[PDB]
Amino acid sequence: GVEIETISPGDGRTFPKKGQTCVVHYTGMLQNGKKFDSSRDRNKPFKFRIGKQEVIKGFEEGAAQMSLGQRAKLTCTPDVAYGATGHPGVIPPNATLIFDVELLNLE
């Protein structure tokens, strides 16, 4: 369950493939909650690769459904990242996560 709301500018064709180290300007948000993690804060925009399950499933599936320049908006379901477990101190159990995802990638 990945719902994509793309802010219009981009190219619409440069999709992430397998093993491509790609760069995302993410900005996390909790439903009826504040921020918890942001690549804008560290200004190190999280050079991660596709296909190793490094990122969560709500963020991995939102990456391949975007293209270069595009600015989508994730609505991550709880049961893909932390719905039953929950992270201690950051993400509670059964949380619907929100991400300001822009795909300005490499490779």
Swiss-Prot record:
Q: How is its activity regulated?
A: Inhibited by both FK506 and rapamycin.
Where, by tissue, is this protein expressed?
Answer: Detected in heart muscle (at protein level). Isoform 1 and isoform 2 are ubiquitous with highest levels in brain and thymus.
Q: Which UniProt keywords apply?
A: Cytoplasm, Isomerase, Rotamase, Sarcoplasmic reticulum
GO MF terms held by the record: calcium channel inhibitor activity; calcium channel regulator activity; FK506 binding; peptidyl-prolyl cis-trans isomerase activity; signaling receptor binding; transmembrane transporter binding
**Can you give the residue ranges of the PPIase FKBP-type domain?**
19-107
Q: Keyword check for Isomerase, yes or no.
A: yes
Q: What does the UniProt entry say about where the protein is found?
A: Cytoplasm; Sarcoplasmic reticulum
Q: Which reaction does it catalyse?
A: [protein]-peptidylproline (omega=180) = [protein]-peptidylproline (omega=0)
Q: What is its main location?
A: cytoplasm
Q: Which GO terms describe its biological process?
A: 'de novo' protein folding; calcium-mediated signaling; insulin secretion involved in cellular response to glucose stimulus; negative regulation of calcium-mediated signaling; negative regulation of heart rate; negative regulation of insulin secretion involved in cellular response to glucose stimulus; negative regulation of release of sequestered calcium ion into cytosol; neuronal action potential propagation
Keyword Disulfide bond on entry: no
- The EC number of this protein is 5.2.1.8
What interactions and quaternary structure are annotated? Identified in a complex composed of RYR2, FKBP1B, PKA catalytic subunit, PRKAR2A, AKAP6, and the protein phosphatases PP2A and PP1. Interacts directly with RYR2.
Functionally, this protein is described as follows:
Has the potential to contribute to the immunosuppressive and toxic effects of FK506 and rapamycin. PPIases accelerate the folding of proteins. It catalyzes the cis-trans isomerization of proline imidic peptide bonds in oligopeptides.
Q: Which family does it belong to?
A: Belongs to the FKBP-type PPIase family. FKBP1 subfamily.
Spell out the PANTHER family in the cross-references. Answer: PEPTIDYL-PROLYL CIS-TRANS ISOMERASE (PTHR10516), PEPTIDYL-PROLYL CIS-TRANS ISOMERASE FKBP1B (PTHR10516:SF429)
- Tell me what this protein is called: Peptidyl-prolyl cis-trans isomerase FKBP1B
Species of the source: Homo sapiens (Human)
Q: Give the encoding gene's name.
A: FKBP1B
